[PDB]
Amino acid sequence: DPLRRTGRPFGGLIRDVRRRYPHYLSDFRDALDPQCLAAVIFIYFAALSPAITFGGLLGEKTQDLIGVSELIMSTALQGVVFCLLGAQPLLVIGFSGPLLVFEEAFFSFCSSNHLEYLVGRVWIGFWLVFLALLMVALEGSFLVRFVSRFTQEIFAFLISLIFIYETFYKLVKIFQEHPLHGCKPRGQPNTALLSLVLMAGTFFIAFFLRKFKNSRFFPGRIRRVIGDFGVPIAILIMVLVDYSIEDTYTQKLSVPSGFSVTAPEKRGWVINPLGEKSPFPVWMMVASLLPAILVFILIFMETQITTLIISKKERMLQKGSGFHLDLLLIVAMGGICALFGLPWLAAATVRSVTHANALTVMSKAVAPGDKPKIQEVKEQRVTGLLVALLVGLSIVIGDLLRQIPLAVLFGIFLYMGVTSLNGIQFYERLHLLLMPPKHHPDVTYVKKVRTLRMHLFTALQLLCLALLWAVMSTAASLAFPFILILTVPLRMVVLTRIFTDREMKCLDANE
Amino acid sequence: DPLRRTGRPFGGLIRDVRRRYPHYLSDFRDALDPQCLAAVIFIYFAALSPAITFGGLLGEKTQDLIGVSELIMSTALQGVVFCLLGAQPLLVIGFSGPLLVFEEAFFSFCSSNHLEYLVGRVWIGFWLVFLALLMVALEGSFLVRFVSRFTQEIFAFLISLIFIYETFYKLVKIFQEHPLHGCKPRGQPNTALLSLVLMAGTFFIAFFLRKFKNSRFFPGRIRRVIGDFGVPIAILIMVLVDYSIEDTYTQKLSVPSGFSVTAPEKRGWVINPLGEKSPFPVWMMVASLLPAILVFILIFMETQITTLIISKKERMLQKGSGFHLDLLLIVAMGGICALFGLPWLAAATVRSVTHANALTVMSKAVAPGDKPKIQEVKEQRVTGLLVALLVGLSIVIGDLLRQIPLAVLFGIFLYMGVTSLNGIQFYERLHLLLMPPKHHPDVTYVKKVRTLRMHLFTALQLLCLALLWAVMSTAASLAFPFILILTVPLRMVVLTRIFTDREMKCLDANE
């Protein structure tokens, strides 16, 4: 049991080192395999797409301070370091939705308080490194056991709603900027309507190709390969559509050529922690701990829940693991990295399972067709190292990246926020609220609890989400991570009195 | 058995009369019921929409000679007469796709041969009446038994393809007329992407609403009501969308006010058979027999097959049938009706099944549940007569019909041509050409015949369709009705030699 209080300082980390690094030769020896070559392209595309789209969003929101070049460099550096000297090489590192929300909230708060956006970031990172060291030294990584399904589903639903809502707003802004009138440019014909066509065309191509994977058409070998290319194909089709129309203006993303620093007129490659243009107030270096705690919660929750999912007994990963070394490495890198600008990164649970699923080799089954035994996972470090290097050497092609319309990306930004709602039991219980009770499916949380006591759980769980959404839209949007972890004590004491022990074994089951 | 050669000249007509007319009182007495009032609005909408859309097509195709007013008047008159003095009033009379194709072909032939378009139509009408009388007097209505599934599926697939192809052509023409350029009107900003948005929006609203009917969401009573409103809701939504945009130009269908004659500057309410402006040639009054035969086949094939489907043993219609009287009434009416302009009409199989479904009464189920026994159908004359009189008094609201965009209608033209492909066994066998043989469904024509002998039948059936489509795209696109019935002799003599008896009982089964 990795999550056990040994009692010695840095005990868990030392145990992770001693049970992981002795195998530093097999991780490089197991590189020679066609499966690795097949997976290195799929995961490379799956990591590049939510790098350019998130960089575009961040460049628009952060007033062209952190753009596409910065996020790509950060992803490349952190991925290379983590894969080279980490403990779970299958765990990919990438920018996430909650981090984007927190960054825009911090930017708004800093703007509405006359401070400098990139000077307080360095102090946030400085406090974050110390906080991570203190948490690792006291063996506090066992707290992940206290986060049940009641919180993860709420958080996932909130993030999906944010993704969905950050696209209709952009459409509304485009129609307000380029109105439909008879005969930043600020008013062009055939621009507000091509944008609507462009992101609707790319959402439906990618949606239907994903639906084509699960279908029974075509041989299984060809169907599986094409199905994995749902997003890369959708971008390629719609870029060629806009390339043919050369007389109409459409907004395109901005990638500086070479190794520039995203409009080098407001920022340099090195940020002065003491002050750039005006003295930094004395009260914003010893009171920069409260924001450091809130950002630490998001990184801790994303990075540790993902390790639980990938280390489940269903997946036969027997080489070692990491629960203390991985957290110390990720958080301490972000604090040092924030000195040079650049954003913080966390582990991505959607891309990590895809990375692992592309490396497992199934067994044979003379028995009727099912999901057979999973012998070996072919775990290694070579596959994850090359991908982080390939994303790094994607800024030399900035000439081709500058031809991608901004509307094409927002179509996928909506696709990623709507196909992420599957598997969320909070989402499935929402359909059951409309279906007649005779049509409900045969699931564990249906037969063991009567329906009137099942809708009360959903209403209580949905009430919390509305309350947390409202906080994020006020002037105190910086404090929403605190409310997120405030639901865990609620389930310990409040739900226990109102719900019997019988109910809270099928609704909250972690299996 | 109505289809039996009695031997007397007008045997079938008198046989139908003496078993249909004596109970004239019951057909009017059975009117008082809420089912009729519920079904009348549904069938009214289902008959009105493919009258305005077909009139919109016909106005453009026929150079504003037969438009929307004429088609509505023809539908109203023929419906009233048929429902008043005809057998089996459950039939719904309406303009069909094959008739539209034939009228377009005849218009092209008349244009490319210096003849007038509405003068030869009257002679075709007289000849059509003569052959209807001759056909009925010789008891030739039993020939419908010789048309098997091999011909009906080909005909349906060809019509659906024509419907689909008559929309992308219109989109291409709009985009060539209103090109995308920087800053009949013949060139306006926007008004080319709006048309693409308008017909894509109305196709998806109607498509998803139909998919909502089969779902398990919502109470059963509410689901079926708004489920039947797939098309009327889709039109209402997209008209309100184009009403808000008042600065952009969108093409709208032309409905003359009052009882005008669709631009009465080139036509009158009466047509001179001997000539309007120039002496009509002597060699198109005795050689209009060939077009009269060809149009007779379409009316004969479409009308009689519909009666068989409605009078199947599954539907408990035992009140009397009209295999003989209906054909004489419909065909002879069109010949007289063509004297006053106006188009020919035939019974519609899609709206006839829907009309019967809306009046049937299911029974209770002691068993766990299936489609129970059908107790009574409530066949009558009042329901069909009111609808024909309600479509007729829809030209007084021509001010409201003039605000419907022409792009909204073509969205439903494509919807009708794609949801009509279900139930066609020729369409279902086309999917099986791509599925792996392990995934084929549990269907009768799958296990009894090996797969390699099943794809030969589909390829032979598909080869005929391509040959029939080729003749329709040439300058001799008038003999395609003749080629259509030429498939029946092919199956009698040619296919039976190459296929064993075992195969031609599951592929060609009529049950």
Author numbering:
A (entry chain A), B (entry chain B): 673 to 855, 893 to 1220
The authors write:
Anion exchanger 2 (AE2) works at high cellular pH to catalyze the exchange between the intracellular HCO3− and extracellular Cl−, thereby maintaining the pH-homeostasis. Here, we determine the cryo-EM structures of human AE2 in five major operating states and one transitional hybrid state. In conclusion, given the presently revealed structural models, the AE2 uses NTD as the intracellular pH sensor to mediate the anion-exchanging activities of its TMD, thereby maintaining pH homeostasis.
The 2D and 3D classification showed that the image signal for the NTD turns poor in the basic environment; thus, only the TMD of hAE2 was well solved and modeled. The co-existence of the hAE2 in the intermediate and outward-facing conformations at basic pH indicates a more flexible TM arrangement of AE2 upon the pH elevation, which might result from the disengagement of the TMD and NTD. Along with the elevated intracellular pH, the loopTM10/11 is dissociated from NTD. When the cellular pH raises along with the acid secretion, the pH shift-induced conformational change, possibly in NTDs, would release the loopTM10/11 from NTD to allow the helical re-arrangement in TMD, resulting in the removal of loopCT from the inner vestibule and thus allowing the access of bicarbonates to the substrate binding site (“ready to load” state, hAE2interbasic-KNO3).
